[PDB]
Amino acid sequence: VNTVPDVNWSKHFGFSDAAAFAVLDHSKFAFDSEVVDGKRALADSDNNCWVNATCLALQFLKPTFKYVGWEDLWNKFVTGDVAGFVHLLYYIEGVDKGAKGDVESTLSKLDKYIVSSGSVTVERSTLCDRCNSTVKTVTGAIAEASVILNGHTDGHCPHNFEWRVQVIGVKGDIILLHSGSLLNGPYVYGDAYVAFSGHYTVFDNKLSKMYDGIKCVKTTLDTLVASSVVIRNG
Which lies closer to Zn ion via its Cβ, residue 153 or residue 181?
Answer: 153
Name the minimum Å distance from CB 165 to Zn ion: 15
Contact track, Zn ion, 122-161, x by CB under 5 A: ------x-xx-------------------------x-x--
Rule CB under 5 A: is residue 36 a binding residue for Zn ion?
no
- CA quadruple 32, 71, 107, 57: dihedral positive or negative? negative
Which lies closer to Zn ion via its Cβ, residue 159 or residue 206?
Answer: 159
DSSP 213: T
Region of residue 167 (phi > 0: left; psi between -120 and 50: alpha; otherwise: beta): beta
Piece of the chain touching Zn ion by CB under 5 A; list 89-97, 120-128, 179-187, 222-230? 120-128
CB 95 within 8 A of CB 101: yes
Which has the closest alpha carbon to 217: 203, 200, 196?
203
Which lies closer to Zn ion via its Cβ, residue 78 or residue 157?
Answer: 157
Contact track, Zn ion, 70-109, x by CB under 5 A: ----------------------------------------
Per CB under 5 A, contacts with Zn ion among 194-233 are none
Name the minimum Å distance from CB 158 to Zn ion: 6
CB 92 within 8 A of CB 107: no
- Cross-strand pairs, 176: 143, 229
Which lies closer to Zn ion via its Cβ, residue 36 or residue 157?
Answer: 157
Dist. CA 169–CA 159, nearest whole Å: 28
Name the minimum Å distance from CB 129 to Zn ion: 8
Name the minimum Å distance from CB 152 to Zn ion: 18
How many residues bind to Zn ion according to rule CB under 5 A?
A: 5
Which lies closer to Zn ion via its Cβ, residue 28 or residue 159?
Answer: 159
Q: φ and ψ at 134, to 5 degrees?
A: -125, 155
Strands, E assignment, the chain: 33-36, 39-42, 118-125, 134-140, 142-144, 152-156, 162-172, 174-177, 192-196, 200-204, 209-212, 215-218, 225-231
What is the contact surface with Zn ion in residues (CB under 5 A)?
128, 130-131, 157, 159
